[PDB]
Amino acid sequence: LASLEKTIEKAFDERDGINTATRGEVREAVEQSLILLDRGEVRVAEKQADGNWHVNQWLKKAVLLSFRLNPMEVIKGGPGQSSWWDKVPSKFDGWTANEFEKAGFRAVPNCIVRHSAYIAPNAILMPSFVNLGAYVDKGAMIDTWATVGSCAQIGKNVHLSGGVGIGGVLEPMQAGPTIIEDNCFIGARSEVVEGCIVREGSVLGMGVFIGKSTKIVDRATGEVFYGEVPPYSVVVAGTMPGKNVPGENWGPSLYCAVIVKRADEKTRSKTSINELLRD
Amino acid sequence: LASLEKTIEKAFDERDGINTATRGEVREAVEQSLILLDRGEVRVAEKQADGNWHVNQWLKKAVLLSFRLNPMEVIKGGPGQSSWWDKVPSKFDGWTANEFEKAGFRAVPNCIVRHSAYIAPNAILMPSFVNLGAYVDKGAMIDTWATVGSCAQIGKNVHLSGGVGIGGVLEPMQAGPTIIEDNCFIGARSEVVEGCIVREGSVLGMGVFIGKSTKIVDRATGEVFYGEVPPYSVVVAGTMPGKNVPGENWGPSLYCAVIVKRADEKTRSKTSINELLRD
Amino acid sequence: LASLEKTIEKAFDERDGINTATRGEVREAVEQSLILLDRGEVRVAEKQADGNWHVNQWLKKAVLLSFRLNPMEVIKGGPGQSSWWDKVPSKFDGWTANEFEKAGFRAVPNCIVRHSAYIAPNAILMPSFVNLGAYVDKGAMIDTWATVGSCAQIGKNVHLSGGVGIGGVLEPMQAGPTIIEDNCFIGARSEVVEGCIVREGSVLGMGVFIGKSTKIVDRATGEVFYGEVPPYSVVVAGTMPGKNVPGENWGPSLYCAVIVKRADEKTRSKTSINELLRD
């Protein structure tokens, strides 16, 4: 909403005089904004026709203001009646059956979700962590000890396997968040970080580690590129040869991600994940 | 027990009329069955003389019925008196010192174990997750942020190192669970999934990722195979060369597991893990 | 303090008659010692001029005595009012705002820290695990599902990325703990274990797995070594070629860590992590 956006933009440029004691329109707009984020009714980044993802910067600014509005406090519920110390509440703070019923996702103990992360109906949260401003769309599977970092956009039917980490991107304002598009399968122990994008229907194997510094290599040609996995890619862990050692015909090889197949919606629908990864 | 098995088989074929309101013999048999699973008095898969693992399908059917019998509910105990939302209780629900004394394992906060997973005496659960129907045998070490997936069979004295994930296998009925046999050491960040089997006394290094699609390669010959690590194997992360790039003598290499040594009970008893992995 | 050290040394050699019922000077000295560890006023290992790390063995002995002094007990606070079963209390046991205020670190639910681990001001604990006797120095970032193992020494401004595990070293007495020196960046999914040392200002990429058995390889020469990353190293995941298969010119390659750059304080200050890892 246009009024909220206006209040947040002005407030953020005046943020040095926003603090735990602030009330009025600024506290209300920031509060409302994070509520809208929590319900997925607005999102940090959205895909345009043009097929690219655009940042809604005012939403990152709302999140940043909430740090100023909200105090560090003792947060009960640790082992032996002990406590934590932080300034971000659980998404599930005060939730009863009414709220869980309405949201329609599964939240397995002891998963952690911070307020302002949207979890869509039919998502399954195994013990895992979903950070501020994230958007986890319908039917997503967030497996054990996975992580959905700040502002991260996780598509419909995405499977984040055990120990998969999707890196957070809050600051800078302009910086696009990490994006896993609709219907990707991401194998166990993989990491995608730093505003990298995995396009729709891709299949990553285990131990695929993509950040802004990772060579993503075309199997056919050796073409090296960064930051983006094309649609319907099959990507596995591998290496590229390095310089040979003085006077010898061999050297160490270095990690890269390897695109082993550039497939198809049709093919993805006709071919199992394991078939894709095997032959 | 034979009566329980009979009640469960009939109930499972009639499962569409089993729900949270079901009581009588069906609720009792399912309940008893999961209790027997929780105590390790029965198990999802067992090793036969013949040396292979056989699925007790009725036990998978009991677990699947329990989803129908048990409601989604608000589960207290999250941060700031917040709650979770799921239909599987903690193994430790209502446990006092009597139950922990009898079971004889160590449960470090904030590990999570779902009811129907057997944890044997002298096991150590660091913060970790053990899923339904798992069987964790005597003296097993389940290190921090490890995962023991549904129905997984973990042998005596097995060491699952930090961040090691053992994949769950519930459906299909016939599908064998992931099996780590007696006295295996599994190095940090490794994953074994999808009904793959690591045979007795094997030593896996760090980042060894075995699923049904992973090439497990014999170091001596290049022989490629799938799904099973032989007894007393020493297995490390590696690669195999791919196709060379157009007109060149080189190409990218792809991840595989590499069997670097096919050893011995004697040798495993005489040789340290690090010695095995080093030379 | 010299008196404490004396009481602990004598007690440890008499440890077979120390138990949950022990009181007097032995209970008090062990208690005080772990309190000093918890506050970082003493540490398990310290860097000498001479530039090497020396073990304070009496502190490892205090920790080991505390196992004898402290009983297994039911520890409340699990899901659905369920409990854990262990003999080590949370660092945060009984902590109010006074204690968190004084310590000055951030403790995000649901991180776990055992009593006797020092967390310095301005550290940030995401959901993670810090074990006994660890020393986490000022401004350290402990990301989600990271692990700081027993006695581990983590330097000032160190960034342990998602899923990074730093291995614990309690016994043997003489064994030096795992050490990450000041200003290291450790990329996601990496593991450093077993008393290995990463020297000051080093940058490890994702999936760098260093233990006592891991070949750490010099990119320029192929020089293979173990246990120590030199200062201002840039280290990435890679491989070294193995024996070729019978009669062929090729074979499988095996995992190693690769030092790709031996840099500089100046260079580290002038060059971003991603620049260092990229070119």
Same domain, A167 and A48: no
- Number of structural domains (chain B) is 2
| Cβ atoms within 10 Å of C97's Cβ, excluding its own | 12
Residues B107 and B6 in one domain: no
CB B170 within 8 A of CB B60: yes
Other beta carbons within 10 Å of B48: 9
Q: Torsion angle of alpha carbons A26, A31, A37, A40, nearest 10°?
A: -120
- Domain span at C59: 1-70
Residues facing A96 on adjacent strands: none
Q: What is each CA distance from C90 to B1, C36, C38, C110, C221, in whole angstroms? A: 43, 15, 11, 12, 47
H or E element, residue B185:
strand B185-186
C-alpha to C-alpha distance for C103 and B45, rounded to whole angstroms = 50
* b/e sequence C118-135, b meaning 16+ C-beta within 10 Å: bbbeebbbbbbbbbbbbb
Whether residue B121 is found in the same domain as residue B154:
yes
Nearest to C191, CA basis, from C173, C218, C211, C176: C211
Residue the block writes with tokens 């005489």: B270
d(CA C134, CA C164): 15
3-state SS, residue C126: coil
State the Cα angle at B57 between B54 and B63, rounded to 5°.
Answer: 130
Helices (H), chain A: 2-13, 24-38, 57-69, 97-103, 265-270, 273-278
Measured at the CA of C116, the angle between CA A71 and CA C9, to 5 degrees, comes to 160
**Does a structural domain hold residue C277?**
no
For residue B132, tell me if it sits in a domain.
yes
Cβ of A254 within 8 Å of Cβ of C237? The answer is yes
Six-digit token pair at C14? 């008499």
Question: What is the rounded distance in angstroms from the CA atom of residue B81 to the CA atom of residue A93?
Answer: 7
Given B88, B90, B252, which is nearest A222 (Cβ)? B252
Residue C60 within any structural domain of the chain: yes
Which H helix or E strand runs over B269?
A: helix B265-270
Reported as type and span, the H/E element at residue C235 is strand C233-241
B255: chain A residues, CB-CB within 8 Å? 205-207, 236-238
Helix (H, G, I), strand (E, B) or coil at C81: helix
**Determination technique used:** X-ray
Q: Which residues of C touch B249 (CB under 8 A)?
A: none
The whole-angstrom distance between A1's CA and the closest CA on chain C is: 31
Distance from CA of A139 to the nearest CA of C (A): 23
Alpha-carbon dihedral C88, C92, C93, C97, rounded to 10 degrees: 170
Residue B75 parent element (H or E): strand B73-76
Angle at B177 between CA B175 and CA B183, to 5 degrees: 150
Q: Looking at the partner chain, which of C127, C219, C260 has a beta carbon nearest the beta carbon of A129? A: C127
Q: How far is CA A187 from the centre of its chain?
A: 15
Residue A167: closest CA among A199, A114, A210, A110: A210
What string of DSSP letters covers A209-225? EE-TT--EEETTT--EE
Amino acid of residue A203: V
CATH number, residue B26:
1.10.166.10
Catalytic residue among B149, B168, B176, B205: B168
Q: Please report whether residue A251 resides in a domain.
A: yes
Exposure of A228 by Cβ count < 10 A (0-12 exposed, 13-18 middle, 19+ buried)? Answer: middle
Provide the token pair at A239.
Answer: 């290496």
Structure token pair of residue B260: 């670097």
Helices (H), A93-187: 97-103
Angle between helices B57-69 and B24-38 (to 10 degrees): 120
Instruction: Please give the Cα distance from B246 to C241 (Å, whole number).
Output: 22
Q: Which two tokens stand for residue C184?
A: 């290291």
In DSSP terms, B75 is beta-bridged to: B84
Give the DSSP letter of residue B16: G
User: E-strand spans in A211-276?
Assistant: 216-218, 224-225, 228-229, 233-241, 253-262
CB-CB neighbors (< 8 A) of C252 in chain B = 217, 219, 222, 238-240, 256, 258
Length of chain C: 279
What's C80's DSSP letter? G
A265, amino acid identity: E
| Cβ atoms within 10 Å of C200's Cβ, excluding its own | 21
Identify residue C96 by its one-letter amino acid code.
Answer: T
- Same domain, yes or no: A246 and A177: yes
Pairing mode, if any, of strands A112-113 and A73-76? unpaired
Integer Cα distance of C267 and A21 in angstroms: 43
Residues A178 and A252 in one domain: yes
Say whether C163 and A165 touch across the interface (CB within 8 A): yes
Q: Are residues B138 and B192 in the same domain?
A: yes
Domain end: C10, C36, C70, which one? Answer: C70
Nearest to C100 among A74, A88, A211 (CB): A74
Separation of alpha carbons C4 and B88, rounded Å: 49
Query: Do the chains contact at C255 and B278, CB–CB below 8 Å?
Result: no
- Looking at the complex, report in whole angstroms how far the Cα of residue C158 sits from the nearest Cα belonging to chain B: 20
Cα of A6 to nearest chain C Cα, Å = 31
Whether residues A109 and B77 touch (CB distance < 8 A) is answered with yes
For residue A257, count other CB atoms closer than 10 A to its CB: 24
Tell me if A79 and C96 make a contact (CB, 8 A cut-off). no
Residue C97 Cα to chain centre, angstroms: 27
Burial-class residue B72 by CB neighbours within 10 Å (0-12, 13-18, 19+): middle
In a domain? residue C217? yes
- Nearest by CB to residue C191, choosing from B90, B109, B206, is B206
- C171/C229 same-domain check: yes
Q: Examine the residue annotation and report whether A181 is marked as an active-site residue of this protein.
A: no
How far from A223 is each of A216, A261, B12, B265, C260, CA to CA, in Å?
Answer: 8, 14, 53, 47, 21
First CA to last CA distance, chain C: 49
